[PDB]
Structures are given as structure tokens and as C-alpha cells.
From Swiss-Prot:
This is Translation initiation factor eIF2B subunit epsilon. Signal peptide: none annotated. Acts as a catalytic component of the translation initiation factor 2B (eIF2B) complex, which catalyzes the exchange of GDP for GTP on eukaryotic initiation factor 2 (eIF2) and is regulated by phosphorylated eIF2. Its guanine nucleotide exchange factor activity is repressed when bound to eIF2 complex phosphorylated on the alpha subunit, thereby limiting the amount of methionyl-initiator methionine tRNA available to the ribosome and consequently global translation is repressed. It is found in: Cytoplasm, Cytosol. Present with 33800 molecules/cell in log phase SD medium. The chain holds residues 544 to 704 of 712 of the full protein. Belongs to the eIF-2B gamma/epsilon subunits family. Residues 1-161 form the W2 domain. Component of the translation initiation factor 2B (eIF2B) complex which is a heterodecamer of two sets of five different subunits: alpha, beta, gamma, delta and epsilon. Subunits alpha, beta and delta comprise a regulatory subcomplex and subunits epsilon and gamma comprise a catalytic subcomplex. Within the complex, the hexameric regulatory complex resides at the center, with the two heterodimeric catalytic subcomplexes bound on opposite sides.
Amino acid sequence: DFEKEGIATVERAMENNHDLDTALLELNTLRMSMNVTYHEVRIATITALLRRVYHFIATQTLGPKDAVVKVFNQWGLLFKRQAFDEEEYIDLMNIIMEKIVEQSFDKPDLILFSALVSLYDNDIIEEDVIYKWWDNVSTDPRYDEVKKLTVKWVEWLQNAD
């Protein structure tokens, strides 16, 4: 039950353009209200953002990369207060990858690469957690497509380290 309501809460704050502080206040109130954890919150927030990205692309209102950037550059900041330790950030990235596949975008690899890069540029995620996430990432072939681009990115990051 919390899911749907959480998705709705986030969708509202991005739409009728809420500043974050206020979006997180309502969302967190809902979190305690319905007694759910931050994992559930991350799921709700991530699917909410990814749906808006999808909508932007499917309606040709914005190209893939642009759509991801438009959404994540602004709202991805919500994540820094939805994850407090390493595994929670690892979980954060796993969900994004999983939800992208689930949403079925046409160039999964580009969507996931763009989303992670946006977060990286905004300092929500740094190399250390990124390597950890990547080292423990699922090898289920179902993720082969979405990982194509990001795998090179992680590699580039290691070399440039």
C-alpha cells in the first residue's frame, strides 16, 4: 500500500514542482505513518522518477539522455537522504538497474549510464561505493543489455583513478 502512495507523493512534488526539503518531509511522514523502511522509500522514489523519464521519452518530449538528466539532476538529490550507508547506496543502484529493465526502455544501457552519471556529477555517489556496487552486481543475463555502457564507465573510472 505504501508503494503506490509513495510513488504518488513523489510524483506530486516533481510535477507541481516542489523543492525537495518539502517533498522529503511529506514522504518521510508517510514512511513512519505506514511503518515501512527506507528500502521501500528508495523503491517508491526510483520507480517514480523512472516513470517520468519514460513518459518524457515515449511522448518524444525529450530524448533519452536529456530525459534522464532533466529528472535525475533535479530529483536524484532526494537519494542522499534516503540512503545513509554503503549497502543502502548499493541497494539504491541495484533498484535503478532493476527498475529500468522492468520499465523496459529501448536503450536500457543508455538510461542506466545516464542516471548513474547524473548522480555521480551531483556527488550523490562516488567511486568507492560504485566499485562495491559493481563488484557485487547481479550476473543474471537479464541485465546484460542495461549493463553494456555502464560497465565501460566503471572501467574508465578505475583507470582514471
